[model samples]
Target: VQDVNDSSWKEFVLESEVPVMVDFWAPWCGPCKLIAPVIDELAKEYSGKIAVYKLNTDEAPGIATQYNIRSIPTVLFFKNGERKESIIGAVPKSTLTDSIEKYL
Candidate 1:
């Protein structure tokens, strides 16, 4: 997985060639914590197919603001720099995989 901060948001998310998956999270969020391991596992599972990332809402406020991220554990999927899908909250792995399958 990759770390996207304010400085790298545009370059990392926008310039990426493959599909992108970003988990918008904060340290104090329990739900966000629940999905942390899932995101990590998915990152490895889809290693070659997509670019996985995590952006701490506490740290990258500007980036989060740009995306209108209002909640933690907002899993966003992007293709060619445009958002294509969003999975909100700490959902089951099946739910996540279903959304990912649509894009992948």
Candidate 2:
């Protein structure tokens, strides 16, 4: 939905008042490329209900490293500054919805 990086990642993701979903990806990762539309759907569908954002792993390496994210297309969900759920690499839509449902 939106771009998040080192400078704004903390304030936007960790400090979010509502739940946030962050897609950790890199330009070179094919799976990350394929999951692009999923992020868009979630962003448009969730809207005010959830905050959707993206983090370029290539640019924001430190943020992804802190999460121990070794894979691209890491869909991480956060609530109240804590990681509630995550999907490693690209996964099914159901898996994504199921994981975030707990936070919702």
Candidate 3:
């Protein structure tokens, strides 16, 4: 997926027509690194059905704070400009897929 920064957060996630999944991460976070590949795979696997993006907390701290992301590897799902579900920590691929399916 692509990276979403402070300036693009609103239009990218909040204004997305399809359901959005954002991976809130930072370069220094080990757990975030662990789940990086999983996020990439899902981005391609579910391409048309959903929108997946990565937001680096280091570069886009404002968005992270707005979302109240206290931890790394926080996955937030949004639909129709509303926050729907949040999955914290580095969860399994299946777990993430299950959550996305609910919003779809």
Candidate 4:
């Protein structure tokens, strides 16, 4: 997945043409590490169907706070610039796949 930061947040996430899946994580978060590869796979598998992104909480705590992301490895799905689903913690890929299917 690509990295989304404060500077690109407006264009990349809010203005994305396709459905967006954001993985809110931090460098020091162990669970985030566990889910990193899974996110990458989804990014490739979904390709043009969806946009996958990684948001570092450490770099942009403001965005995290607005989303109420209290935990690392929180996944938020967005469509039409609005948040649609939230999946917290490090879970299975099937769980994520199900979430994506609903929005798609």
Compared with the true structure, model 1 gives a TM-score of 0.93
Better of 2 and 4 by lDDT: 4
Estimate the overall C-alpha local distance difference test score of candidate 2: 0.85
Error of 1 at 24 (Å): 0.6
Q: Note the Cα lDDT for every prediction shown.
A: 0.87, 0.85, 0.91, 0.90
| Model 2 agreement with the true structure over 1-104: per-residue lDDT tens digits | 78999899889988999899898888788888888988898788778878989898888888977889888778889999999887787777777777667778
In angstroms, give how far residue 92 of model 4 lies from its true place: 0.6
**RMSD of each candidate relative to the true structure:** 1.0, 1.1, 0.8, 0.8
* Deviation (Å) of 100 in candidate 3: 0.9
Order the candidates by lDDT, highest first — what do you get? 3, 4, 1, 2
For model 1, the local distance difference test gives 0.87
Residue-level lDDT of model 3, residues 45-86, one tens digit each, is: 999999999998888889888878888779999999999988
In candidate 1, which residue pairs get closer than 3 Å at backbone N, Cα or C atoms, i.e. clash? Answer: none
> How do all the candidates rank in terms of TM-score, highest first?
3, 4, 1, 2
Better lDDT candidate (1, 3): 3
Q: Taking the tens digit of each residue's C-alpha lDDT, what string does model 4 give over 30-92?
A: 988898999999999999999999998999898998888898789999998999989889978
Taking all chains together, the TM-score of candidate 3 against the true structure is 0.96
Looking at model 3, the pairs that clash are: none
